[PDB]
Design an enzyme around this catalytic site. Structure first.
Site, PDB file in Angstrom:
ATOM      1  N   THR A  38      -0.924  -3.104   8.847  1.00 27.03           N
ATOM      2  CA  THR A  38      -2.136  -3.030   9.665  1.00 27.03           C
ATOM      3  C   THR A  38      -1.923  -2.148  10.898  1.00 27.03           C
ATOM      4  O   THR A  38      -1.058  -2.434  11.723  1.00 27.03           O
ATOM      5  CB  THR A  38      -2.572  -4.444  10.111  1.00 27.03           C
ATOM      6  OG1 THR A  38      -3.013  -5.194   8.969  1.00 27.03           O
ATOM      7  CG2 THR A  38      -3.691  -4.387  11.148  1.00 27.03           C
TER       8      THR A  38
ATOM      9  N   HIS B 279      -3.458  -9.814  -1.379  1.00 28.13           N
ATOM     10  CA  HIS B 279      -2.843 -10.349  -0.178  1.00 28.13           C
ATOM     11  C   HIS B 279      -2.934 -11.871  -0.199  1.00 28.13           C
ATOM     12  O   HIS B 279      -3.926 -12.446   0.233  1.00 28.13           O
ATOM     13  CB  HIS B 279      -3.511  -9.772   1.069  1.00 28.13           C
ATOM     14  CG  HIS B 279      -2.716  -9.951   2.327  1.00 28.13           C
ATOM     15  ND1 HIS B 279      -1.694 -10.869   2.442  1.00 28.13           N
ATOM     16  CD2 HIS B 279      -2.794  -9.324   3.527  1.00 28.13           C
ATOM     17  CE1 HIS B 279      -1.176 -10.801   3.657  1.00 28.13           C
ATOM     18  NE2 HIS B 279      -1.825  -9.870   4.334  1.00 28.13           N
TER      19      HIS B 279
ATOM     20  N   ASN C 110       0.788 -14.614   4.609  1.00 31.05           N
ATOM     21  CA  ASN C 110       0.610 -14.497   6.050  1.00 31.05           C
ATOM     22  C   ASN C 110      -0.579 -15.278   6.602  1.00 31.05           C
ATOM     23  O   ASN C 110      -1.173 -14.903   7.616  1.00 31.05           O
ATOM     24  CB  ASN C 110       0.495 -13.019   6.424  1.00 31.05           C
ATOM     25  CG  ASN C 110       1.781 -12.258   6.150  1.00 31.05           C
ATOM     26  OD1 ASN C 110       2.838 -12.861   6.004  1.00 31.05           O
ATOM     27  ND2 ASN C 110       1.697 -10.929   6.083  1.00 31.05           N
TER      28      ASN C 110
ATOM     29  N   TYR D 268      -3.624 -15.909   5.475  1.00 31.16           N
ATOM     30  CA  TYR D 268      -5.002 -15.472   5.295  1.00 31.16           C
ATOM     31  C   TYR D 268      -5.635 -16.256   4.149  1.00 31.16           C
ATOM     32  O   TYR D 268      -5.045 -17.232   3.684  1.00 31.16           O
ATOM     33  CB  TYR D 268      -5.052 -13.957   5.102  1.00 31.16           C
ATOM     34  CG  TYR D 268      -4.545 -13.269   6.346  1.00 31.16           C
ATOM     35  CD1 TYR D 268      -5.238 -13.383   7.550  1.00 31.16           C
ATOM     36  CD2 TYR D 268      -3.346 -12.556   6.340  1.00 31.16           C
ATOM     37  CE1 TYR D 268      -4.775 -12.780   8.706  1.00 31.16           C
ATOM     38  CE2 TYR D 268      -2.870 -11.950   7.502  1.00 31.16           C
ATOM     39  CZ  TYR D 268      -3.592 -12.069   8.678  1.00 31.16           C
ATOM     40  OH  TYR D 268      -3.135 -11.468   9.826  1.00 31.16           O
TER      41      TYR D 268
ATOM     42  N   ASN E  83       0.247 -17.259  11.790  1.00 31.97           N
ATOM     43  CA  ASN E  83      -1.137 -17.731  11.726  1.00 31.97           C
ATOM     44  C   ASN E  83      -1.259 -19.227  11.425  1.00 31.97           C
ATOM     45  O   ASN E  83      -2.180 -19.660  10.729  1.00 31.97           O
ATOM     46  CB  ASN E  83      -1.941 -16.915  10.703  1.00 31.97           C
ATOM     47  CG  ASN E  83      -2.252 -15.511  11.197  1.00 31.97           C
ATOM     48  OD1 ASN E  83      -2.398 -15.287  12.399  1.00 31.97           O
ATOM     49  ND2 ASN E  83      -2.365 -14.561  10.274  1.00 31.97           N
TER      50      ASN E  83
HETATM   51  C1  LIG Z   1       2.426  -3.711  12.739  1.00 33.12           C
HETATM   52  C2  LIG Z   1       2.559  -4.524  11.481  1.00 33.12           C
HETATM   53  C3  LIG Z   1       1.502  -4.597  10.589  1.00 33.12           C
HETATM   54  C4  LIG Z   1       1.616  -5.351   9.428  1.00 33.12           C
HETATM   55  N1  LIG Z   1       0.558  -5.409   8.543  1.00 33.12           N
HETATM   56  C5  LIG Z   1       0.651  -6.135   7.385  1.00 33.12           C
HETATM   57  C6  LIG Z   1      -0.412  -6.164   6.495  1.00 33.12           C
HETATM   58  O1  LIG Z   1      -1.440  -5.532   6.738  1.00 33.12           O
HETATM   59  N2  LIG Z   1      -0.303  -6.901   5.334  1.00 33.12           N
HETATM   60  C7  LIG Z   1       0.857  -7.600   5.064  1.00 33.12           C
HETATM   61  O2  LIG Z   1       0.952  -8.257   4.032  1.00 33.12           O
HETATM   62  N3  LIG Z   1       1.911  -7.564   5.947  1.00 33.12           N
HETATM   63  C8  LIG Z   1       1.823  -6.826   7.106  1.00 33.12           C
HETATM   64  N4  LIG Z   1       2.883  -6.785   7.988  1.00 33.12           N
HETATM   65  C9  LIG Z   1       4.158  -7.507   7.648  1.00 33.12           C
HETATM   66  C10 LIG Z   1       5.035  -6.407   7.012  1.00 33.12           C
HETATM   67  O3  LIG Z   1       4.420  -5.849   5.863  1.00 33.12           O
HETATM   68  C11 LIG Z   1       6.476  -6.819   6.692  1.00 33.12           C
HETATM   69  O4  LIG Z   1       6.514  -7.849   5.726  1.00 33.12           O
HETATM   70  C12 LIG Z   1       7.197  -7.238   7.975  1.00 33.12           C
HETATM   71  O5  LIG Z   1       7.043  -6.207   8.932  1.00 33.12           O
HETATM   72  C13 LIG Z   1       8.688  -7.457   7.730  1.00 33.12           C
HETATM   73  O6  LIG Z   1       9.202  -6.262   7.183  1.00 33.12           O
HETATM   74  P1  LIG Z   1      10.140  -5.287   8.062  1.00 33.12           P
HETATM   75  O7  LIG Z   1      11.251  -6.117   8.663  1.00 33.12           O
HETATM   76  O8  LIG Z   1      10.724  -4.216   7.165  1.00 33.12           O
HETATM   77  O9  LIG Z   1       9.327  -4.631   9.149  1.00 33.12           O
HETATM   78  C14 LIG Z   1       2.788  -6.038   9.152  1.00 33.12           C
HETATM   79  C15 LIG Z   1       3.849  -5.970  10.053  1.00 33.12           C
HETATM   80  C16 LIG Z   1       3.737  -5.217  11.212  1.00 33.12           C
HETATM   81  C17 LIG Z   1       4.886  -5.152  12.176  1.00 33.12           C
END
Ligand SMILES: Cc1cc2nc3c(=O)[nH]c(=O)nc-3n(C[C@H](O)[C@H](O)[C@H](O)COP(=O)(O)O)c2cc1C
Ligand SMILES: [Ca+2]
Ligand SMILES: [Ca+2]
Length: 362
Positions: free
Chosen positions: A29, A178, A181, A183, A238
């Site tokens: 996001t 999705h 998280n 939702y 959440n």
């Molecule tokens: C800025 C941001 C936006 C994210 N948006 C989504 C999202 O839209 N849908 C989703 O399932 N997870 C979203 N996540 C969670 C990530 O997809 C991911 O699972 C989480 O960042 C852990 O992975 P990483 O350690 O490689 O960053 C988001 C995380 C961050 C930091």
């Protein structure tokens, strides 16, 4: 072709799709949609920049107006949105990449200020999430969501199905459901948010029913091996929780087998989850039950990624944070190059700064 040692940079056969490596861009996001929640040229550049990913999962995108919980997230319900996304998919494809759309409904994680006609967020149960939500008038406490009527569930399912059909028209290579998280689909799955008493609450098969019916609907639109599901079995993000996570997500993992899906995508436990002490679901628990392609995610590195691939704990590894800051993350991981540091003050909203202006290698 001979036997070889597999790692992050091995090719992968994801259904009919040939993935050049095992590196996935996690859905992220960024809240940079234009008017009417329509993707635009800047979004296309962004994704185009990252097309060296074996697969891109695009940001969470609401299938219906009621499914929005954050300003300026893109939608996939309108013809204008479809046109906008087509610009994104064309750019990724011209760059030789592949991209799936993540289909979203926030459920109770919204606010009447963000809902059509100022209506109530919908949810499995009338249970207000703790904390505050950002609206155009600053931060406001969440309100009690409206519990969906049993005969309203087919409408929700149709909203996902229509969203998926729209993504198809918009030129995506696949979609990700999705279900994580906290939702809407996740809200139905876990008993901390789901206290219904109809066929969508109580026993695990009932709590799983929305996810399964949504999955079934979407596989009537897409070839099933272009449909993925994302879960967050250990997450509390959440204000969501389940009393028997091993049982709940173990059941889901097994139930998803009948659909012959593209993949199952697991957002794994973060430190906060362990330290505040919800039951952590080991990914191995789900690996033993879901028999298809498994994507893992959460704080992965080149070394941790090679490890899970080599020891067959997972097939693909998704990176979130590192893809924000490193558009050519696959190249950098391969040559052990230095990585750009992500600036969290520009993760959400705004313009090109902290979006498209992270530099490629050298
Ligand atoms: C800025 C941001 C936006 C994210 N948006 C989504 C999202 O839209 N849908 C989703 O399932 N997870 C979203 N996540 C969670 C990530 O997809 C991911 O699972 C989480 O960042 C852990 O992975 P990483 O350690 O490689 O960053 C988001 C995380 C961050 C930091
Ligand atoms: Ca092919
Ligand atoms: Ca087994």
């Amino acid at each position: 072709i001979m036997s070889t040692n597999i790692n992050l940079f091995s090719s992968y056969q994801l259904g009919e799709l040939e993935l050049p490596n095992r590196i996935v861009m996690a859905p992220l996001t960024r809240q940079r949609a234009g008017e009417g929640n329509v993707p635009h040229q800047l979004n296309a550049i962004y994704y185009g920049q990252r097309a060296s990913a074996g697969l891109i999962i695009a940001e969470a995108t609401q299938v219906t107006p009621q499914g929005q919980g954050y300003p300026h997230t893109p939608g996939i319900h309108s013809p204008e949105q479809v046109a906008g996304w087509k610009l994104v998919t064309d750019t990724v494809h011209q760059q030789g990449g592949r991209i799936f759309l993540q289909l979203w409904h926030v459920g109770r994680i919204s606010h009447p200020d963000l809902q059509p006609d100022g209506g109530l967020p919908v949810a499995p149960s009338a249970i207000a999430p703790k904390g505050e939500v950002l609206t155009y008038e600053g931060k406001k406490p969440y309100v009690t969501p409206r519990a969906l009527d049993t005969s309203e569930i087919p409408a929700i399912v149709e909203q996902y199905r229509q969203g998926a059909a729209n993504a198809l028209a918009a030129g995506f290579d696949g979609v990700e459901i999705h279900a994580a998280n906290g939702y809407l689909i996740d809200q139905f799955l876990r008993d901390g948010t789901n206290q219904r008493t109809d066929e969508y609450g109580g026993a695990i098969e009932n709590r799983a029913r929305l996810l399964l019916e949504v999955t079934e609907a979407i596989t009537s639109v897409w070839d099933s091996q272009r449909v993925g599901v994302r879960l967050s079995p250990s997450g509390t993000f959440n204000d969501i929780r389940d009393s028997h996570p091993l049982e709940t997500f173990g059941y889901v993992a097994q139930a998803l087998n009948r659909f012959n899906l593209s993949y199952l995508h697991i957002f794994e436990a973060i430190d906060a989850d362990i330290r505040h002490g919800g039951t952590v679901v080991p990914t191995s628990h789900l690996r033993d039950r879901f028999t298809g392609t498994l994507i893992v995610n959460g704080g992965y590195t080149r070394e941790k990624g090679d490890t899970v691939i080599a020891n067959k704990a997972a097939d693909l590894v998704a990176f979130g944070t590192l893809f924000i800051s490193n558009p050519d993350l696959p190249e950098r991981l391969e040559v052990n190059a230095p990585l750009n540091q992500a600036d969290p003050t520009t993760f959400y909203g705004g313009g090109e700064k902290g979006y498209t202006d992270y530099p490629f290698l050298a």
